[PDB]
PDB file of C-alpha atoms (C1' of nucleotides) in Angstrom:
ATOM      1  CA  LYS A   1       7.361  51.125  31.006  1.00  0.00           C
ATOM      2  CA  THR A   2       6.083  48.541  28.519  1.00  0.00           C
ATOM      3  CA  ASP A   3       4.770  48.874  24.961  1.00  0.00           C
ATOM      4  CA  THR A   4       1.523  46.993  25.656  1.00  0.00           C
ATOM      5  CA  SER A   5       0.797  49.320  28.586  1.00  0.00           C
ATOM      6  CA  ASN A   6       1.135  52.308  26.256  1.00  0.00           C
ATOM      7  CA  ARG A   7      -0.928  50.682  23.493  1.00  0.00           C
ATOM      8  CA  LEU A   8      -3.780  49.764  25.835  1.00  0.00           C
ATOM      9  CA  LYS A   9      -3.853  53.232  27.411  1.00  0.00           C
ATOM     10  CA  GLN A  10      -3.899  54.755  23.924  1.00  0.00           C
ATOM     11  CA  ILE A  11      -6.969  52.719  22.948  1.00  0.00           C
ATOM     12  CA  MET A  12      -8.634  53.570  26.274  1.00  0.00           C
ATOM     13  CA  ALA A  13      -8.098  57.285  25.630  1.00  0.00           C
ATOM     14  CA  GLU A  14      -9.171  57.233  21.970  1.00  0.00           C
ATOM     15  CA  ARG A  15     -12.349  55.175  22.417  1.00  0.00           C
ATOM     16  CA  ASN A  16     -13.315  56.263  25.949  1.00  0.00           C
ATOM     17  CA  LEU A  17     -13.047  52.687  27.229  1.00  0.00           C
ATOM     18  CA  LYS A  18     -12.361  51.713  30.838  1.00  0.00           C
ATOM     19  CA  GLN A  19     -10.605  48.485  31.805  1.00  0.00           C
ATOM     20  CA  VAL A  20     -13.986  46.911  32.564  1.00  0.00           C
ATOM     21  CA  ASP A  21     -15.285  48.110  29.186  1.00  0.00           C
ATOM     22  CA  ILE A  22     -12.496  46.448  27.193  1.00  0.00           C
ATOM     23  CA  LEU A  23     -12.881  43.430  29.489  1.00  0.00           C
ATOM     24  CA  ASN A  24     -16.552  43.051  28.558  1.00  0.00           C
ATOM     25  CA  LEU A  25     -15.835  43.341  24.829  1.00  0.00           C
ATOM     26  CA  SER A  26     -13.353  40.464  25.090  1.00  0.00           C
ATOM     27  CA  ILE A  27     -15.932  38.091  26.605  1.00  0.00           C
ATOM     28  CA  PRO A  28     -17.427  36.899  23.292  1.00  0.00           C
ATOM     29  CA  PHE A  29     -13.893  36.403  21.953  1.00  0.00           C
ATOM     30  CA  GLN A  30     -12.965  34.540  25.147  1.00  0.00           C
ATOM     31  CA  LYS A  31     -15.695  31.928  24.665  1.00  0.00           C
ATOM     32  CA  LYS A  32     -14.853  31.695  20.962  1.00  0.00           C
ATOM     33  CA  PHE A  33     -11.107  31.054  21.168  1.00  0.00           C
ATOM     34  CA  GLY A  34     -11.103  29.478  24.622  1.00  0.00           C
ATOM     35  CA  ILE A  35      -8.760  32.164  25.923  1.00  0.00           C
ATOM     36  CA  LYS A  36      -9.875  33.402  29.343  1.00  0.00           C
ATOM     37  CA  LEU A  37      -8.985  36.808  30.793  1.00  0.00           C
ATOM     38  CA  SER A  38      -9.442  38.086  34.347  1.00  0.00           C
ATOM     39  CA  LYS A  39      -9.584  41.742  35.402  1.00  0.00           C
ATOM     40  CA  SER A  40      -6.479  41.476  37.581  1.00  0.00           C
ATOM     41  CA  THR A  41      -4.490  40.257  34.578  1.00  0.00           C
ATOM     42  CA  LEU A  42      -5.678  43.210  32.495  1.00  0.00           C
ATOM     43  CA  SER A  43      -4.901  45.552  35.391  1.00  0.00           C
ATOM     44  CA  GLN A  44      -1.249  44.464  35.438  1.00  0.00           C
ATOM     45  CA  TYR A  45      -1.033  44.989  31.674  1.00  0.00           C
ATOM     46  CA  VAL A  46      -2.074  48.638  31.934  1.00  0.00           C
ATOM     47  CA  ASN A  47       0.303  49.255  34.843  1.00  0.00           C
ATOM     48  CA  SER A  48       3.391  47.576  33.346  1.00  0.00           C
ATOM     49  CA  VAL A  49       3.456  44.983  36.138  1.00  0.00           C
ATOM     50  CA  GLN A  50       3.337  42.185  33.575  1.00  0.00           C
ATOM     51  CA  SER A  51       3.189  41.629  29.808  1.00  0.00           C
ATOM     52  CA  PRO A  52       0.503  39.535  28.044  1.00  0.00           C
ATOM     53  CA  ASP A  53       1.385  36.037  26.819  1.00  0.00           C
ATOM     54  CA  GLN A  54       0.861  34.517  23.365  1.00  0.00           C
ATOM     55  CA  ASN A  55      -2.829  33.626  23.735  1.00  0.00           C
ATOM     56  CA  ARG A  56      -3.905  36.900  25.376  1.00  0.00           C
ATOM     57  CA  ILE A  57      -2.053  39.139  22.908  1.00  0.00           C
ATOM     58  CA  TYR A  58      -4.138  37.512  20.172  1.00  0.00           C
ATOM     59  CA  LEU A  59      -7.308  37.777  22.272  1.00  0.00           C
ATOM     60  CA  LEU A  60      -6.854  41.512  22.837  1.00  0.00           C
ATOM     61  CA  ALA A  61      -5.962  42.118  19.186  1.00  0.00           C
ATOM     62  CA  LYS A  62      -9.286  40.650  18.064  1.00  0.00           C
ATOM     63  CA  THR A  63     -11.245  42.471  20.768  1.00  0.00           C
ATOM     64  CA  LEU A  64      -9.803  45.916  20.036  1.00  0.00           C
ATOM     65  CA  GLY A  65      -9.614  45.348  16.278  1.00  0.00           C
ATOM     66  CA  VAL A  66      -5.869  45.950  16.032  1.00  0.00           C
ATOM     67  CA  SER A  67      -2.897  43.829  14.924  1.00  0.00           C
ATOM     68  CA  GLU A  68      -0.892  41.713  17.376  1.00  0.00           C
ATOM     69  CA  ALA A  69       2.291  43.465  16.238  1.00  0.00           C
ATOM     70  CA  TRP A  70       0.842  46.917  16.912  1.00  0.00           C
ATOM     71  CA  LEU A  71      -0.255  45.850  20.386  1.00  0.00           C
ATOM     72  CA  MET A  72       3.315  44.707  21.069  1.00  0.00           C
ATOM     73  CA  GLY A  73       4.889  47.714  19.379  1.00  0.00           C
ATOM     74  CA  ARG A  74       6.350  51.069  20.372  1.00  0.00           C
ATOM     75  CA  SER A  75       4.610  52.728  17.421  1.00  0.00           C
ATOM     76  CA  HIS A  76       1.647  55.053  18.013  1.00  0.00           C
ATOM     77  CA  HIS A  77       0.205  54.636  14.521  1.00  0.00           C
ATOM     78  CA  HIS A  78      -2.725  52.360  13.652  1.00  0.00           C
ATOM     79  CA  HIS A  79      -2.847  50.095  10.595  1.00  0.00           C
TER      80      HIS A  79
ATOM     81  C1'  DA B   1     -13.927  49.416  39.421  1.00  0.00           C
ATOM     82  C1'  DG B   2      -9.344  48.812  39.885  1.00  0.00           C
ATOM     83  C1'  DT B   3      -5.105  46.851  42.734  1.00  0.00           C
ATOM     84  C1'  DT B   4      -1.930  43.512  45.310  1.00  0.00           C
ATOM     85  C1'  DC B   5      -0.083  39.008  46.135  1.00  0.00           C
ATOM     86  C1'  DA B   6       0.553  33.919  47.429  1.00  0.00           C
ATOM     87  C1'  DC B   7       0.304  30.215  44.609  1.00  0.00           C
ATOM     88  C1'  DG B   8       0.444  26.810  40.535  1.00  0.00           C
ATOM     89  C1'  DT B   9       1.962  26.381  36.271  1.00  0.00           C
TER      90       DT B   9
ATOM     91  C1'  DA C   1       7.921  34.449  34.474  1.00  0.00           C
ATOM     92  C1'  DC C   2       2.982  33.982  33.340  1.00  0.00           C
ATOM     93  C1'  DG C   3      -2.564  33.981  34.863  1.00  0.00           C
ATOM     94  C1'  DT C   4      -5.782  33.764  38.610  1.00  0.00           C
ATOM     95  C1'  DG C   5      -9.038  34.549  42.534  1.00  0.00           C
ATOM     96  C1'  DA C   6      -8.968  35.954  47.415  1.00  0.00           C
ATOM     97  C1'  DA C   7      -8.950  39.890  49.685  1.00  0.00           C
ATOM     98  C1'  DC C   8      -8.520  44.475  49.397  1.00  0.00           C
ATOM     99  C1'  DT C   9      -9.438  49.671  48.819  1.00  0.00           C
TER     100       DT C   9
END
DNA sequence: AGTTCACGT
DNA sequence: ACGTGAACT
């Protein structure tokens, strides 16, 4: 339903990462930027229950090595 | 490991 | 409307 949900699922499929896998990779970035992230929050992202806010869109962009705009976009193409 | 929801913001 | 942990499967 949401763009973020489709962008996360795309990364999960391409890099064979589970939710817990992406969650663990964000941990060093969480302590660094002071932006916490629980597993229930990530779960709602993937399932279009809720969209990430300003701080967590940045957090996930750094973790997955993608741009904030791509993570918020409809586009399928990396850059 | 992943999901739902009352609650605080 | 957003994140979170309790409680859940």
